[PDB]
Design a protein that fits this description.
Keywords (chain B): Mitochondrion, Ribonucleoprotein, Ribosomal protein
Structural class of chain D: mainly alpha
Distance between the termini of chain F: 62 Å
Subcellular location (chain B): Mitochondrion
GO cellular component, one term (chain B): mitochondrial small ribosomal subunit
Largest interface: B-D, 40 and 34 residues
Distance between the termini of chain D: 70 Å
Helix content of chain F: 40-55%
Order of helices and strands of chain D: HHEHHH
Largest sheet of chain F: none
Family (chain B): Belongs to the universal ribosomal protein uS10 family.
Structural class of chain F: mainly alpha
Protein name (chain B): Small ribosomal subunit protein uS10m
Strand content of chain D: under 5%
Number of strands of chain F: 0
Shape of chain D: elongated
Number of strands of chain D: 1
Largest sheet of chain D: none
Radius of gyration of chain D: 21 Å
Helix content of chain D: 25-40%
Radius of gyration of chain F: 27 Å
Oligomer: part of a larger assembly
Number of helices of chain D: 5
Chains: A mainly alpha, B alpha+beta, C mainly alpha, D mainly alpha, E mainly alpha, F mainly alpha
């Protein structure tokens, strides 16, 4: 018989909540409410780091002299070459 | 070097299940030897085993752009080193964890300790 | 012809350093591990951020020390820090070295809120290991 | 060895509890699990290692003996074949202290709502009997 | 300070998708349901459709991190294997290396 | 009154011993929340200011009368059960979810 379901209903009624059964396809609501969504997972929104204020600080450091950017040094060399041969 | 013993109730760990994960064998052996030495100095027994690795290989294309003929083999390893303890005060366990973490090998030799408290009843 | 980290031979007169004179597959045989972090486990999070921070700090220390590096760096992790073991090349004066080290330490501490204290190893001549 | 002999203090000795965890189970068989992993880098928080159960024996606490014919089947994956590990697991909340508080409150509410039986507590069925109760 | 504009596109998409999620999940649960007629179902459908564009995780394309390169990218590491392969070759990755077997 | 505090701090420092060792620097780092904890307890905070489990599983106060044999009450009970079965969501999040769902079911 349905003694397992009866005991489950009793355990639920011990505090006041659901008791009667429902449809089979209705379990999607419980499956969704019992777990978190995918958009809130760290493997989605936490994809691209900012690097905005960090890049600005790095540029200020480059302009300070104590720290230099080799790639930006090559870029400045190429810019000088273009200004001498451009333009 | 002061005991600083008070009179408040403390927690007692019931069967402290410990497990250390690590890729290579040399670092794992060094870590397990250090842990066994520390336990013997504290006064606790241990037990080890010989488990296999964890083949979680992930293959991808060889060249960064075109070409897909040959792929590349990349995977990480891990050997479980069980060193579960038994019976130890909360303060002693905290000091043990502090001493173990003050020099834990970064990356390699990952610890996986599982505590089991009791919490007094009403 | 694949040419990852292994250097192609041309003449027996290539003053290559120790770390640079090692194939990229000897990580479990001859070559060790430079940087280390739990991100490369099976399986723990905190991997992308750690790799980005390591790749950034490497270039940062290489730029702050232009030519004063005998070889690549060897990052580490002990607490809320990131020890950097480097084989500095005796180029500038010790006063300038100390000043730059202190400035970089203070800047990193006030920027990332993480005291990335580094370590030096002054060596005049580069550690040549092979003549590829 | 020197550091261990030095730090021998800064702790609290434990009484002769007798190893093997036999007396611990004979007295307080409660055993709530809890683990904590390790991470390297600026961040230290690791909420992933928050697995916690609610293993508290019913017959050992001794406050609702009437639940012998109720909790033996009302709870999920229990009623072992050989051994006996009564655990009213309810990991619907993360923390541990609040978990124990909720366990105490649940035991109280169970006492209350069980000492006044519901309906099909004694009059079970005719083909499902974990413990013999009329009719048959 | 991103390289290509696809990076900013994906960043904005992720931000506007993570902005709201409670109502999204509620309406998604209300959708697939035999209980209550299709009246409230269609009402909730129209409500969720009234939301503005962009704000949707469907538009999120999991690319790399350098310059948006969806080519064998690992979501666990986010960034593509451009520099990750270099590290795996050198040995700057604690474990992740060539499968020596 | 800034100069007064400055002079007081200067006098307190002159009447005390400096660092004189790196252990003082480590203690200062630990005080400033720089390094991790000794040990990594993995419990810094997260107490939620005591939730008292008065809104997770117990549906006593959260009732609102409605025909039990109806489908709306059954759906609400199932939704509340599913929410209680989610140990990941926060307390305020679940409270807001329940409140919004109840208001939407009452109005619409």
């Amino acid at each position: 018989s349905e003694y397992a379901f009866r005991m489950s209903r009793l355990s639920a009624r011990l505090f006041g909540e659901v008791t009667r059964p429902t449809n089979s396809k209705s379990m999607k609501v419980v499956k969704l409410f019992s777990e978190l969504p995918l958009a809130k997972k760290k493997e989605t929104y936490d994809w691209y780091p900012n690097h905005h204020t960090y890049a600005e600080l790095m540029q200020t450091l480059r302009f300070l002299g104590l720290y230099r950017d080799e790639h930006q040094d090559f870029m400045d060399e190429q810019k000088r070459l273009k200004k001498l041969r451009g333009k | 070097p002061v005991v600083t013993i008070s009179d408040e109730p403390d927690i007692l760990y019931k069967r402290l299940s410990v497990l250390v994960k690590g890729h290579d064998k040399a670092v794992l052996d060094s870590y397990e030897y250090f842990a066994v030495l520390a336990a013997k100095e504290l006064g606790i027994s241990i037990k080890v085993h010989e488990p296999p690795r964890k083949i979680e290989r992930f293959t991808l294309l060889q060249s960064v752009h075109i070409y897909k003929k040959h792929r590349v083999q990349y995977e990480m390893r891990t050997l479980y080193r069980c060193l579960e303890l038994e019976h130890l005060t909360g303060s002693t366990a905290d000091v043990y964890l502090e001493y173990i973490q003050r020099n834990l090998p970064e990356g390699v030799a990952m610890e996986v300790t599982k505590t089991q408290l009791e919490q007094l009843p009403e | 012809k694949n040419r990852a980290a292994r250097v192609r031979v041309s003449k027996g007169d290539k003053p290559v350093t120790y770390e640079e004179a090692h194939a990229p597959h000897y990580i479990a045989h001859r070559k060790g591990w430079l940087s280390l972090h739990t991100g490369n486990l099976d399986g723990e999070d905190h991997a992308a951020e750690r790799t980005v921070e390591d790749v950034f700090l490497r270039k940062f220390m290489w730029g702050t020390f232009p030519g004063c590096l005998a070889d690549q760096l060897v990052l580490k992790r002990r607490g809320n820090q990131l020890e950097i073991c480097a084989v500095v090349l005796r180029q500038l004066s010790p006063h300038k070295y100390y000043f730059l080290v202190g400035y970089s330490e203070t800047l990193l501490s006030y920027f990332y809120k993480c005291p990335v204290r580094l370590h030096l190893q002054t060596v005049p001549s580069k550690v040549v290991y092979k003549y590829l | 060895k020197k550091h261990c002999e030095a730090l021998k203090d800064f702790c609290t000795e434990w009484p002769a509890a007798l190893d093997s965890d036999e007396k611990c189970e004979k007295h307080f068989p409660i055993e709530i699990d809890s683990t904590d992993y390790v991470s390297s880098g600026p961040s230290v928080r690791n909420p992933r290692a928050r697995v916690v159960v609610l293993r508290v024996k019913l017959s050992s606490l001794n406050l609702d003996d009437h639940a012998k014919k109720k909790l033996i089947k009302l709870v999920g994956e229990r009623y072992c074949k050989t051994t006996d590990v009564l655990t009213i697991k309810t990991d619907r909340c993360p923390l541990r202290r609040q978990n124990y508080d909720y366990a105490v409150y649940l035991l109280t509410v169970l006492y209350h709502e069980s000492w006044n039986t519901e309906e099909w507590e004694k009059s079970k069925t005719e083909a499902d009997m974990e413990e013999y109760i009329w009719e048959n | 300070h991103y390289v290509d504009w696809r990076m900013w596109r994906d960043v904005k998409r992720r931000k506007m998708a993570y902005e709201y999620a409670d109502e999204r999940l509620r309406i998604n649960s209300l959708r697939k349901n035999t209980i209550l007629p299709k009246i409230l179902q269609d009402v909730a459908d129209e409500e969720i459709a009234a939301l503005p564009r962009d704000s949707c995780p469907v538009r999120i394309r999991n690319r790399c991190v350098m310059t948006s390169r969806p080519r064998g990218v690992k979501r666990r590491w986010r960034l593509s294997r451009i520099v990750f392969r270099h590290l795996a070759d050198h040995g700057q990755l604690s474990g992740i290396q060539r499968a020596t077997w | 009154s800034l100069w007064d505090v400055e002079f007081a701090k200067q006098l307190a420092t002159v009447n005390e011993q400096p660092l004189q060792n790196g252990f003082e620097e480590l203690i200062q780092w630990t005080k400033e929340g720089k390094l991790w904890e000794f040990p990594i307890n993995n419990e810094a905070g997260f107490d939620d200011d005591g939730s008292e489990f008065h809104e997770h599983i117990f549906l006593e106060k959260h009732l609102e009368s409605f025909p039990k044999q109806g489908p709306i009450r059954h759906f609400m009970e199932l939704v509340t059960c599913g929410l209680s079965k989610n140990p990941y969501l926060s307390v305020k999040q679940k409270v807001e979810h329940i409140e919004w769902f109840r208001n939407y079911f009452n109005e619409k």
